[PDB]
Design a protein around this ligand. Structure first.
Ligand SMILES: *[C@@H]1O[C@H](CO)[C@@H](O[C@@H]2O[C@H](CO)[C@@H](O)[C@H](O)[C@H]2NC(C)=O)[C@H](O)[C@H]1NC(C)=O
Ligand SMILES: *[C@@H]1O[C@H](CO)[C@@H](O[C@@H]2O[C@H](CO)[C@@H](O)[C@H](O)[C@H]2NC(C)=O)[C@H](O)[C@H]1NC(C)=O
Ligand SMILES: *[C@@H]1O[C@H](CO)[C@@H](O[C@@H]2O[C@H](CO)[C@@H](O)[C@H](O)[C@H]2NC(C)=O)[C@H](O)[C@H]1NC(C)=O
Ligand SMILES: *[C@@H]1O[C@H](CO)[C@@H](O)[C@H](O)[C@H]1NC(C)=O
Lengths: 49, 49, 49, 49, 47
């Protein structure tokens, strides 16, 4: 009922109630790089990639 | 027939369809220990302690 | 002891005596190949499981 | 001696010629005999230790 | 800079005990008389 990889994580499973398969995808969690001058109101944001 | 069990370490090989092809007991011979420490069935050329 | 159900025996099946249904934690039936020649099982425990 | 309840005492004797036998075969995990799959995990085209 | 837990949860687990099947016994074609009032004890099951 579960799908695992060589690294040890889970990347999929199967539902026993509806007989449908899925692929578990990791969710986004990143930071923002902001450039700020000496005296400014708001800095300039940059979402990398 | 009954035989005792012990906490061992084995190496499993999975094919495209997820069927176990062969297994190697890491406490059988020295080549088995090499395959255990290299995490592969075709270890490279080198000196292993 | 276990009493044969195909050809019978001289004794009666008696391995437990319970007037009412005792407290059970697991109960499930499984099916296997009747025309099989050999069967293999694995039983072990760790951390109380 | 397993239990502590008297259930049947029809024919009980003391047989002293019952000795378990030792098989002539050994454990061979080369082709996969003696190994069990994971609980509910699937591995495709991987080598897991 | 800085780099929330939704309340939506998915809980799936295979049961270890069979169903009680109380509706099958209550909807039986045989209805006992008030003098009989047959009794069936249900234990170690899920409902
Ligand atoms: C999911 O697949 C399983 C496997 O085929 C289905 O179980 C079968 O159900 C039919 C219909 O009752 C039975 O005749 C078979 O004997 C069952 N097979 C097994 C191995 O149990 C199951 O019904 C499917 N579930 C859904 C929601 O489609
Ligand atoms: C698993 O199978 C066994 C044997 O087929 C079932 O035991 C039977 O239970 C019924 C109902 O209590 C009795 O009338 C039979 O006499 C029992 N047979 C034997 C050989 O003891 C058991 O009920 C099954 N378990 C489940 C959960 O279905
Ligand atoms: C199964 O795994 C093997 C090993 O990773 C894969 O073989 C590699 O395939 C890539 C892409 O074709 C090549 O660049 C590598 O050189 C191959 N390595 C070896 C050692 O042969 C194989 O492609 C995988 N098969 C499937 C269906 O995913
Ligand atoms: C059960 O085993 C016999 C003998 O090994 C085989 O002929 C038969 O096909 C098996 N049953 C199933 C359903 O595979």
């Amino acid at each position: 009922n579960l799908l695992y990889d060589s690294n040890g994580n889970i990347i999929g499973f199967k539902d026993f109630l509806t007989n449908k398969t899925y692929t578990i995808l990791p969710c986004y969690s990143g930071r923002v790089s902001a450039a700020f001058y000496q005296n400014s109101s708001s800095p300039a944001l940059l979402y990398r990639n | 027939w009954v035989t005792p069990l012990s906490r061992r370490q084995y190496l499993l090989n999975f094919d495209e369809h997820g069927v176990i092809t062969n297994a190697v007991d890491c406490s059988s011979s020295f080549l088995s220990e090499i395959q255990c420490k290299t995490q592969s069935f075709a270890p490279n050329t080198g000196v292993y302690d | 002891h276990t009493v044969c159900k195909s050809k019978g025996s001289i004794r009666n099946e008696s391995w437990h005596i319970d007037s009412s249904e005792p407290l059970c934690l697991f109960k499930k039936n499984f099916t296997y190949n009747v025309s099989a020649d050999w069967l293999y099982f694995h039983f072990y425990q760790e951390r109380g499981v | 001696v397993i239990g502590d309840f008297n259930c049947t005492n029809s024919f009980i004797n003391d047989y002293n010629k019952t000795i378990p036998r030792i098989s002539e075969d050994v454990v061979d995990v080369s082709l996969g005999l003696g190994t069990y799959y994971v609980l509910n995990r699937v591995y495709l085209n991987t080598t897991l230790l | 800079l800085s780099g929330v837990k939704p309340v939506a949860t998915v809980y799936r687990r295979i049961p270890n005990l069979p169903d009680c099947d109380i509706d099958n016994w209550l909807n039986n074609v045989s209805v006992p008389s008030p003098l009989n009032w047959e009794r069936r004890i249900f234990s170690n099951c899920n409902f």
